Structure 1
């Protein structure tokens, strides 16, 4: 799994032609050590590859890989502002707001332009994470129509729509830690779903996707919220650890060859 200028252009073809099937064998495995011999890469290809690759994991319901892809395009240092760096920080907030409730901090080796120029220019995205911590669907709807002019000029339409449904799913998972068997009528007041009939339809979508495990008790008009009865004692879990450890022993062997090469060349 190597990287080059050809691999960066392959991700651009998947953006125009909406078909993420060929982009699966070339993105499911992490890549390292680019192919270099006479010069075939540039700084613009390293920022356009991570920006185009993050959009594939976003639509594929793969938020675990989308957060890592969008983080590499921000940590790259620069001297001024650019269109790629601006769209990378705006999408970093919308992705982190779906998984957790607050935006993750930036590393120490990040660029200073993001925290001095991109941060004040992205005032419409920074205020969105402040209201998300309060968990209020009435106040979140007022920010969509207010910042509608900013989401259209920055071609960010569709990414903010996933955060609207994420607040309703977060309130259901929040009641699982506090409450246990809440009534169907009481669940339509905190989450605000207008009627108990709309509450039974929203909880059924999380069962098919696998975000939470619950059981609807129609005999009493309530709903139960239990945890996952998995002690991780199946023999299939041991094979996942052995398969994941095969990539750790290979990454250390590759770093030993690069460390001996630098020691051969004279340094200060």
Structure 2
């Protein structure tokens, strides 16, 4: 959000302010997010003018992210090791690998119910079922799966059964949704007023 706003914000120059906004933004888009974020709506011109052609870093980023190649992963890593180092921001490669396992897992999630970790060691790159044991550890660990430790077979059954908002606390989740959107519309009205408040003619 921050960097999409900063970039779609009016701009004409290039900057590693903007370049690294680009950086952490698209890192979110790929490392955090499932895969490539799309072009924002009211983006700045000079980006495509200046910084988008400068954006070869994440051109190859989104490319290799599509590729699912760990070798080319580390190749691009050595490529931009400068930016890796530049602001105590090393480990971005491990971040992209995290997003890799994100892609693999989330892929397998709705597709399966429970799988062999060594087979899925091939699938997600689970590094054998035992490293996949620590991975399933992550699954039940990192807020990662509706599933538990079928340790008899180490099995991990997808559920995705959080709520029908079938607890009123979820209804109040909705309620605070409501709070936000209501005060939002209220300030929309106030500002709409204020444009009406503009000195006309």
Q: TM class by shorter-chain length? A: 0.7 to 0.9
Structure-2 change in CA distance of 1:102 and 1:242 (3 Å): same
- Alpha-carbon shift at residue 88 of structure 1 (Å): 0.8
- Alpha-carbon shift at residue 236 of structure 1 (Å): 0.7
- Alpha-carbon shift at residue 182 of structure 1 (Å): 1.4
Structure-2 change in CA distance of 1:235 and 1:142 (3 Å): same
> SS state of the match for residue 217, structure 1?
coil
Residues in 2 aligned to 1:252 and 1:222: alpha-carbon distance in whole angstroms: 47
Contact 1:81 1:117 in 2 (8 A): yes
Query: When the two structures are aligned, how many residues end up with a matched partner?
Result: 201
The answer to whether the aligner puts 1:91 opposite 2:27 as a matched pair is: no
Contact 1:188 1:195 in 2 (8 A): yes
- Alpha-carbon shift at residue 146 of structure 1 (Å): 3.2
Structure-2 change in CA distance of 1:191 and 1:142 (3 Å): farther
Contact 1:181 1:225 in 2 (8 A): yes
- Alpha-carbon shift at residue 200 of structure 1 (Å): 0.5
Unpaired runs of 5+ in structure 1? 1-67
Q: TM-score, normalised by structure 2?
A: 0.83
- Alpha-carbon shift at residue 118 of structure 1 (Å): 1.1
Contact 2:33 2:99 in 1 (8 A): no
Q: CA-atom RMSD, angstroms?
A: 2.5
Structure-2 change in CA distance of 1:137 and 1:191 (3 Å): farther
- Alpha-carbon shift at residue 156 of structure 1 (Å): 4.1
Residues in 1 aligned to 2:170 and 2:81: alpha-carbon distance in whole angstroms: 46
Structure-2 change in CA distance of 1:214 and 1:139 (3 Å): farther
* Cα-to-partner distance string for 1:219-260 (whole Å, 9 max, x where unaligned): 346543333353321111112222222232223233333333
Residues in 2 aligned to 1:257 and 1:177: alpha-carbon distance in whole angstroms: 44
Residues in 2 aligned to 1:92 and 1:189: alpha-carbon distance in whole angstroms: 30
> SS state of the match for residue 149, structure 2?
strand
* Cα-to-partner distance string for 1:169-225 (whole Å, 9 max, x where unaligned): 331221122232212321212223433321101120232221222233333465433
Q: Larger relative contact order (C-alpha < 8 A, sep ≥ 6)?
A: 2
- Alpha-carbon shift at residue 162 of structure 1 (Å): 1.8
Contact 2:165 2:171 in 1 (8 A): no
- Alpha-carbon shift at residue 84 of structure 1 (Å): 1.7
Contact 1:75 1:111 in 2 (8 A): yes
> SS state of the match for residue 178, structure 2?
helix
- Alpha-carbon shift at residue 95 of structure 1 (Å): 0.5
Residues in 1 aligned to 2:140 and 2:71: alpha-carbon distance in whole angstroms: 25
Structure-2 change in CA distance of 1:151 and 1:118 (3 Å): farther
User: Which range is displaced more, 108-117 or 160-169?
Assistant: 160-169
Contact 1:184 1:223 in 2 (8 A): no
Q: TM-score, normalised by structure 1?
A: 0.65
Structure-2 change in CA distance of 1:178 and 1:78 (3 Å): same
* Cα-to-partner distance string for 1:54-91 (whole Å, 9 max, x where unaligned): xxxxxxxxxxxxxx222211111122223322221111
- Alpha-carbon shift at residue 112 of structure 1 (Å): 0.7
Unpaired runs of 5+ in structure 2? none
